[PDB]
Amino acid sequence: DVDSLRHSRSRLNIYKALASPSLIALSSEDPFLTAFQLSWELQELSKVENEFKAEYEELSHQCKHFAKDLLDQTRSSRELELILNFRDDMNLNNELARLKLAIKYRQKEFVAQPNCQQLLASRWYDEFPGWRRRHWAGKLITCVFIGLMFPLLSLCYLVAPKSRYGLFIRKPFIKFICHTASYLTFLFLLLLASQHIVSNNPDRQGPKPTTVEWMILPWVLGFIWTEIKQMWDGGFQDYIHDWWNLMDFVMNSLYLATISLKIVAYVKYSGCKPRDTWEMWHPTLVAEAVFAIANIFSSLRLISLFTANSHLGPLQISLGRMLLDILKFLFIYCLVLLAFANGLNQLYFYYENSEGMTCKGIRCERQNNAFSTLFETLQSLFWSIFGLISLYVTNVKADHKFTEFVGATMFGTYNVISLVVLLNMLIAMMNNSYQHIADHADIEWKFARTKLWMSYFEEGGTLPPPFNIIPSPKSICYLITWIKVHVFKRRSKRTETFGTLGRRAAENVRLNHQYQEVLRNLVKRYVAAMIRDAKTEEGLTEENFKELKQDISSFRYEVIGMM
Amino acid sequence: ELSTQEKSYLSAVEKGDYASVKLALEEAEIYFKININCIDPLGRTALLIAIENENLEIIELLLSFNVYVGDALLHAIRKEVVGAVELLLNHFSDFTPDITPIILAAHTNNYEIIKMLVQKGVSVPQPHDVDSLRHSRSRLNIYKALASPSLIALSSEDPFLTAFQLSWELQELSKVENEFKAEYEELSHQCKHFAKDLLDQTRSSRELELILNFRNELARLKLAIKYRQKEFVAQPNCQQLLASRWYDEFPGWRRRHWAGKLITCVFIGLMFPLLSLCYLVAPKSRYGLFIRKPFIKFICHTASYLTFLFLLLLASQHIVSNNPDRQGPKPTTVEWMILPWVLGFIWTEIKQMWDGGFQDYIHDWWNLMDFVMNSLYLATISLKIVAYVKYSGCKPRDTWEMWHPTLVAEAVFAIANIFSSLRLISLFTANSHLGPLQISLGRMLLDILKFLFIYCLVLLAFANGLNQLYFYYENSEGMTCKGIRCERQNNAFSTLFETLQSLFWSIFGLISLYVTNVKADHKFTEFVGATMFGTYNVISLVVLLNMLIAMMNNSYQHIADHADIEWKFARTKLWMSYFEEGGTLPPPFNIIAENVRLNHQYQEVLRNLVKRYVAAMIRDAKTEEGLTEENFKELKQDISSFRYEVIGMM
Amino acid sequence: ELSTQEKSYLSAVEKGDYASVKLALEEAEIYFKININCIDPLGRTALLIAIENENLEIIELLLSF
Ligand SMILES: CCCCCC(=O)OC[C@H](COP(=O)(O)O)OC(=O)CCCCC
Ligand SMILES: CCCCCC(=O)OC[C@H](COP(=O)(O)O)OC(=O)CCCCC
Ligand SMILES: CCCCCC(=O)OC[C@H](COP(=O)(O)O)OC(=O)CCCCC
Ligand SMILES: [Ca+2]
Ligand SMILES: [Ca+2]
């Protein structure tokens, strides 16, 4: 293509052609899948073009509305379950395959449909009807009961999930309650890991794990194993796509580093040393610091559960969807900080001033040598945005009053830029950002809530992390066979394991015909509700006036002619 | 499924040729080579098209020729073509199976159609499965049908109560569906304006008095306050009645200027004792019936509050306080005079809780502070009398033991001082300038508790962290006052409760640095400790507060267009608490054919009142709505059916 | 509050049919079986319909009878 606008216009015209609802009804033997792949195409191509991004995003949103409006035309729960439960067999049920596909395409306005959400809600509370008698304390007591009850409620499923109570945790909401209860017990053990009622002697290099640490360790392994399990099904494709997933990955890496540093301390520490005499950069200290940071991340990570609660849900979503703006603006803030740090170091480079300043640094009792090196200047310029820095850091141990004046002026310019210019700009930016992320704060929240629900729908990691590492009843029959993949036992899986006739197509064919009939009815209803609600419901333009005028005029002329 | 012989016939209907269509029907019977009830390629029965173009001339022909009617009624009803309905009445589907002509006619809100069906005897199945969305749809299709203004005007003898009980149902049934919530506020807030729009038809103060004073005085308004009908009381001419009743004794109070309003209020404010004692002893004719006037009682009531606090201002002065060092001191003189108000407020509180049964008492976010306001006074009195027995030694306060009954008593009284001084804010609901501001300042208070939930939890996240690092450095041996509130900020991150403290005070920049230092050279431990501290301010101080500003700012906008109607509901709910002659005494002086004729007189008001609404609703919506293509396509068919007739006869 | 001999009369005013309406007002005098100034069920006077359709041709007729 030597020219470019002809080709670009041709491509946009093509997409805008087969993105029309009317054409999808005629062609497109599978309108849902068509709209889905088409929205994906245009969303991923609105960045490749990047000059027509408005048009392509508009078209993708239009076909998303088409998918939602086509799902809307269902008239019976039977008609809905087939739509949500459908997928290509290819000889490979009812586990909401179409809905998971819709999640996979970021079709967030298709899963916010009312009756679809009703189906999911019904399938979430299967253990017990109602959940509408609940109130401020009615729901709390039944959830607190299970949150206390999860140990043996989990053990029952572990050993005897036949008929008594193993199916009671398999149910999704109970699984959620048990998981969040396990997380809360983890956090309780973490808070209690700092009390002196259990802590080991501080004056002991590389001590053996304390009993609380012994209890904590199975949670560490459980979280590591569940994150490896989650990785082994998304293949670092959606794994990185979830920012919560990145946060918990770094948390588990910090836990791994903590275990390694603790044990490598234990192999050679010999103990019996006061903490005030420990050499800097000792494995126990760094292990403790990493453990603390991991505690911070762990206690933060429960924010994700607030997507389930119908009150912190949208608020947490809006929190998430203006974090990008704060990152963009914080990059500029960091650039300005580096600039002023450069200058301030240039100025107070020579006044080293460490003859009597005991414990030199910004973080002293006197804030001395704040600008005497690049690191301390970076750090001092950070703290000044909070006011925790004082003046007289700009003073020097001499009568060089002009140097002090220009340094104070540079520091004041930095403060005016940050706390009066930049921070106010940040506020005025997120004000309009929130003003433009409230129109779809509900639909997007419901999409996130569905994403959280479907994680607990499947019969996968049904076991909370404390009772997850516990080996399966076999435990030596699945790991080995999956380990027999680099040898001849990889091919001994599709010859002797399967020897039957594979009698499934006759069910598959009837299922597909039933789904096709449902699609045919939905499409006919959508057409009959798009002609009668959009064609005859728009405005009256000048052209229609002209047509009516000319109809009258032709009438007059012909009746004149006939006499 | 297409052909060619009827595509002219199907278009002969659409053009509107009476002659050609009549011939095609005639040839249909003899030579069955054409389907009378054909289907358009887009899908429209020959009758279904004549319905759309409102042609009664050819609807007659199709109806007279045994055409398949099908759901043509349901389609005519949706298109609100009145002329076609009489023809159809007197003789796979698009709509949901549960929809019936009366249910769908109420959806369109068309009086002419609705009145015509109800005479035929149609009935609306009143509200109360294995399948979910045939119930939730049908239930919403019922409620939206019987929440329609036009249907309520025909059935539902008492339109006001019907718009009241119903609006309660939808409001309390949105929270149970929780997913059709938007589709239900669309209905509850639709019938909340029906009440206001029917009450506006009143054309005299007489016809207004009957509405409110029906099942004495202001019978119905006491009820609409219960149903949170806040768009019904804010009606202006109704609010005019209240103000003319809230300034009852003395006329005017419009001529008085800025300073004129003030002299005559403070002057009553300084006569509150004598204006209450006169009612206390003899409310015969002189002044005991002056307090009974709603305004004056408010001023006396408000005056008492001010005076009450005034002692709280006095109770802390050294001139009236007792000796500093007195184990369980005897009550001081001002405290003794304080005591009547404490009992005064409790007595009216128990009276308030008696008429609400804790279900209406708990609803106000005021009585939740009023309760703790009083309940901390029992903890004030009980502690002092406990300190008055088995504790009297006149011992210097330095050596007093912690948790001593007086110290608990003094603090718990101090806290109750705040919960009382802040409680006069509710008296600002009356001031027209601080009224809308205060009510709109509390309508987004919830959107701050919802957000100090996160900051209460992020604060736990780092307190979990910084403790886990520093807790091996206690150092609470050398530096006296091993706490945070000291001159030299000792070991702020030492215990869990000290780090909950240390982090909280950091949001105000009150926690200096070097609290992150340690009494050693572990410059890594300090640094990571300082980093955790620093990144806490970034998340909270500059990112969480900023998203709190950016969130109330939006939340304010949704509560601004109704920041006035809400306020007059808060004011009326404050006025009406003084209208009734109940607790009509300030706290310190507090402890010391009968209805058949009325009914048939009130029924004649509603019958005119509703008739005054319908005749003033069609002139405002049925002849004032926008213009759409479906009307334009009618005029073409209106002329084509006329040119094909004038030419056809020549 | 309905009838039959007026519903065509009221429609004739609504349809603008000046031809039929003059007959009813001319046939009313001989046989008082039709209410000239009646009210339709929705509530609109016969003459008020002509006021509503801005049709001067029958307004002059109505006021004339
Ligand atoms: C944008 C950079 C402004 C200069 C900042 C500065 O440090 O100069 C302050 C000067 C002198 O104060 P210092 O130099 O800070 O000691 O005083 C003013 O001019 C106040 C003007 C107040 C202006 C808000
Ligand atoms: C935000 C929760 C922080 C809890 C930290 C803490 O335990 O200290 C209590 C803090 C300050 O009291 P100190 O313990 O002395 O720090 O008071 C409040 O939180 C008032 C909030 C009332 C808000 C209306
Ligand atoms: C927004 C200013 C960023 C500039 C970075 C900088 O000055 O150095 C980082 C400093 C490191 O030095 P400390 O103040 O000791 O933590 O603080 C942070 O880590 C906060 C970043 C955490 C932000 C989430
Ligand atoms: Ca994860
Ligand atoms: Ca009270």
Residue numbers in the entry:
A (entry chain A): 186 to 277, 283 to 753
B (entry chain C): 28 to 118, 136 to 172, 186 to 272, 284 to 660, 696 to 753
C (entry chain D): 28 to 92
Sentences from the paper on this structure:
Within the TRPC1/4/5 sub-group, TRPC4 and TRPC5 share the highest sequence identity of 70%. Both proteins can form homo-tetrameric channels that allow the passage of Ca2+, but also Na+ ions to a lesser extent. The architecture is typical for the canonical TRP channel family with a transmembrane region (TM domain) where the pore region of one protomer domain-swaps with the voltage-sensor-like (VSL) domain of another. The cytosolic domain harboring the ankyrin repeat (AR) embraces the coiled coil helix in the center and the N-terminal ankyrin domain is associated with the TM domain via a helical linker domain.
For the TRPC4-CaM complex, we added a 10-fold molar excess of CaM to tetrameric TRPC4 in the presence of 10 mM calcium chloride throughout the purification process after detergent extraction. The CaM complex sample yielded a 3.3 Å map with applied C4 symmetry. The core region of CaM binds to TRPC4 by forming hydrophobic interactions, while the peripheral residues of CaM are stabilized by hydrophilic interactions that are typically observed in CaM-protein/peptide complexes. Interestingly, when CaM binds to TRPC4 the selectivity filter is slightly widened and contains a density that likely corresponds to Ca2+ or Na+ as in the case of the inhibitor-bound channel. We observed a much stronger density at the Ca2+ binding site in the VSL domain for the CaM-bound structure compared to apo TRPC4, presumably due to the high Ca2+ concentration we used for preparing the CaM-TRPC4 complex. There, CaM binding stabilizes a longer stretch (residues 677–692) of TRPC4 that is highly flexible in the apo state of the channel. Therefore, binding of CaM to this region of TRPC4 likely reduces the overall flexibility of the channel, fixing it in its closed state.
